[PDB]
Symmetry: D3
Subunit: 260 residues, 6 copies
């Protein structure tokens, strides 16, 4: 009921947050089947790319094993649960593309930023709603990931005012990389997914990982070691590069076998 | 030297006041300043701080505690006095908003980056003036913070060439998050501070703290622990969340008490 | 013959990647010597700024007899070949002088990485960028790209670019800050010489240390620690030159400053 | 018979026994897979305050079906196998309760890495350690070894051990701080339980946050950012429980503290 | 007066925590005259080295908070934690090296205080505990979980923090929580000998050594960090004739007399 | 001839600092090619492990046309910085055979080696402070706390005291302490152990260790370690050979290939 999965294209999974009346709020009865679904899809090798979207007008508007626990540990467990949604998205083998169909506020914004790629429809808007909710603006990666997406100036402004950021702004400042018509939003994300599906699987998987490890790295030279090894790993253990050369000489798109 | 006003009951306005010399860095304009910042930080009537310069510029004399010292150490002390200004702004409880009314060059550009939010007048401009002055372009956090605000390609060009950056370009590239008409600059800044003041006190404090801490962090996962803890702190120790829900339901302004 | 070195302006070296027929893809047997040329220019004190551009229509496509390979098995030889490219990137960074990428055409794969290794990036109207590793069936990330691209253009744009293997045209490159400037093809070298001459007009140690603090600031964990390095450099040039007194005099009189970099 | 046993030797202490002694408790996927699910399950088990891990038989820890590989090729399959082991290290790290490694014998290769992923390390006199990835013809580094060994014992000692693939006996391990405690073989479990009992009598959130700050302290770049996390955690427990007043009343009354983690 | 300041040698300040009937606890009454006094000392150019110690039996264990008009409970708690954080950070920031003369119990905040100092010397009577954990809280506070593993390694720090055990002076010296242990009646004398050595060296030389050590803990990259160290070395070498003076003092059979100038 | 190179065992290069009269001091003119000697060894595939020592009692104590003194001084610091970074970057492990005084830059040089071994007569000092400068250069303030911990590093650097061989071993500044007559023998045995192991195996080990110092995320660094581990595992038959060698009670002879 609360989370839907579809296969709109043969290698592309679409995950729908489905509690439209609550704008797909990050309640636990949503976020728990959400997390498990992500784990299942990471393990499913027919899937090369994943799109996330909200049912209805919003994208996302942001407990078990609690026997014997007091309220303060329980709250710790509840936040940990949401933290794990964020880290699970980042750890998935496949790139995750956020199809931001509407409001993406508070934790919904953090959810977008936990994806690899972000696409806005004309109707998407964003807010750091933690601050409007009388708490902090910062939760679930937001104070880490927002400035790395759009820079300090724009991130501070957004986090300290709790103002609305519309689709035009979002694309202008690089909060999303694309902005499209509402009724083409998913189609655009599928088109992204399909380009990804035609690339090397380990090639793609290591690319996603080096980007995230790249945020968590503070030496160029150290990080370059990880990047190089993955390039050589795929080069030596597949015939992909010979195949891309052979395809481009025979004026043809490449078909990658990911093995010798 | 430095004037302070209360143009709204929870907004302190700090006016750098040596207009004849473009409100320049001065080891007698600078250290008074530091203690004024400290006092404003301890001043619980103040929720937001606005800094601007008198006259047309924004920001471009005995080093105290000097007896017994020699030239090399004296010079370390004087640079340290400036480094502490940068660091004191970052440490203040309240967000600091730069109302950039005119030239911000050298240390003046550094000051503005030490502020949380940057708002440009159409008449504002920026320069990495250390380089035009026969020195390096880098000081006072500039080579750390500028690239994190506007990205490397743009940061390097501005710092290596020592060119002037006008208001249009500053706003376009994310050096400031807003550009407005000269006559509306302070009022735009008052409206921002008033929003901040309408939000949770510890909410805001911890938000500002997580943003700065976020630049000084190199692990997504470590940083999330700090954000989450602050979020739960305010959630559990206040009734703020319920008050935001009640005010939203009753179409009225939130009045956060920051207590249960 | 694989790269040309010219001196178009008195204190500016132009390095022209010269395999036009292969869009300036560089050979593994050119790599050790190419790094020696950069090294030599670093130690050429006539040179205050370096411009790198492509011969023919392309800028650089990166990948194409690896030296010091005797007795090695294939897997090690491959690590050695990746290291040679790594070290080219690091050498640019390490050069005393700022390096300006005059991007005249396609900068793809290793060529995008090369531009990112340079301090300043200027695009011709004809320039394009692509993370071609992914199009070539490998990963998109090599040679610092996964580290340096988000630091240029932020994560949203970088992840899109790297994962979809699309082309970024000159317009989009300036807009998103992959390059700082975009000019007509016939003005590209001229724009870069003008930037180079500004730089030559500044203090040599002032410039050298600016460049080093920039790269050092990316490899830095703490605002406070990094300030220590910056401040030390600023005091170093201030106390060991009268450059600062010269800049004040030069503005009083309305003449260009002429820094002596000594007292 | 199952490759991983769990017991409850003391009311709030889980004992995890790696239980394929015929292979010195090697990290074949038959052992590790049910290892990881049991760890997760224990983390969700609120009866348990501390976890102890040991090896059955002579060894502490020294291949089988890789799951979810349908439609996958060799190189990707190898990626999955390595991730599976990585996830083990990260799960131990991420568990609510402190883990105590009761090292009763050989901890070599992945087994040394396993010990390093625990919070506390106690050696039997019979314990010994080896970075056996190197002796196996590979690198010495995997599963965090090259990150964590030097954080445990310093670079000098780590490099020596990793590059030479020598045995480090119990006397050395305790002396250099690879383990914090060394005890007779017959007292090993007893020593670990006493540790686990001290832990159980401390605050639950207090302990959980301590473990988390220690681990995130090592993934931290700034003393000052780290203190923010630490202080938040301290204020959290202080303001939301009466533990601190309990601690005061307990010392004034000369009794064990009895923390209720609540007001 | 909850803090005493003495001048036991002409270039050495001694700071005594002076509430022995409470084992010198980190009450705000103590911690206020602390930070401002340390800042004062930092600006006193007669002082080349600082020693900190506790009156009576203990070193330091774990009163209106100022500036809290109109704050609520949780914000006042933030303010009080910040006060303590800023003491840690001030010690780090002082020009002169701070030597902890640890004469007794150094538990919780008092252990954290010792880690905030550059050099730690234990009396034979000294002992350490991460007492936040014994107090029903976390063991981690005031830099502890950052600085303990960097002093002694993870294995040892984890054990100590999770068990709330007492760490005697023999252990503290063995595991490098302190670099020295001496007889209790010789404690201050040992730290004074350390301070006089410090005093005999370059002032910039010593100031930049301390700063690079602290910054190096907050550094991500060796190569980055080397740029800071090299600049400081070149700065002192080129702005003083100290290096020539150390060469000449050796030859001429006379002590080095560094005047920090040419 | 301020640098000697020998080959005391078949895959082992000995680099002997050879200016004993000056206790093997940093000479500016005789290190701009000493970096090149290391670069030549690094690219010599006959050599598996490098041992560095000093002649005599001690271990260890251009292009400026048109430059001014401040910049010449930056150039001069750079060349010494380049020596530190070069050791770190060599393909092969570098073993410091510390036979005597290792003071100042001589201590930093030792810290830039992978493995440190002290003679009983070896001693150490952060001599920049005794020289009226700072104690910190060439990595010292970064690498010394990561070898011996903060407490001990700060004491050593701020006091400029002597650290004898006994203390060096006890605190982990060196990992081994031997009799003077046995120093080079101990380092050769270690070198030949290294030579017996996989070449890419060894090279990636060194790199991960150095890189691991310049990492601030466990999870990040684990990606690098695993990739390198898988790379050698699938691209060679070493693992299968180790297995076979044990079972046949013979030494392993790794081919670094399938
Ligand atoms: Cl639309
Ligand atoms: Cl054109
Ligand atoms: Cl001997």
């Amino acid at each position: 009921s609360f989370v839907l999965v579809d296969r709109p294209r043969p290698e592309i999974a679409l995950v729908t947050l489905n509690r439209p009346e609550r704008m797909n709020a990050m309640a636990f009865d949503v976020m728990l089947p959400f997390k498990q679904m992500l784990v299942d899809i990471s393990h499913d090798n027919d899937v090369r790319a994943v799109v996330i979207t909200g049912a209805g007008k919003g994208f996302c508007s942001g407990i078990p094993h609690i026997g014997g626990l007091t309220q303060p540990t329980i709250a710790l467990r509840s936040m940990e649960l949401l933290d794990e949604v964020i880290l699970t998205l980042r750890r998935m083998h496949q790139p995750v593309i956020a199809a931001i169909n509407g409001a993406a506020i508070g934790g919904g914004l953090c959810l977008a930023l936990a994806c690899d790629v972000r696409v806005a429809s004309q109707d998407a808007y964003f807010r750091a709603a933690g601050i409007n909710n009388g708490l902090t603006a910062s939760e679930l990666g937001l104070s880490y990931l927002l400035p790395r997406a759009i820079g300090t100036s724009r991130a501070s402004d957004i986090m300290l005012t709790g103002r609305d950021v519309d689709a035009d702004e979002a694309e202008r400042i690089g909060l999303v990389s694309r902005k499209v018509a509402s009724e083409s939003l998913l189609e655009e994300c599928y088109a992204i997914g399909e380009r990804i599906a035609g690339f090397s699987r380990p090639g793609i998987e290591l690319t996603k990982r080096t980007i995230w490890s790249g945020l968590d790295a503070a030496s160029l030279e150290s990080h370059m070691h990880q990047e190089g090894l993955g390039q050589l790993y795929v080069r030596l253990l597949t015939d992909n590069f010979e195949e891309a050369t052979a395809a481009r000489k025979e004026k043809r798109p490449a078909e990658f076998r990911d093995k010798r």
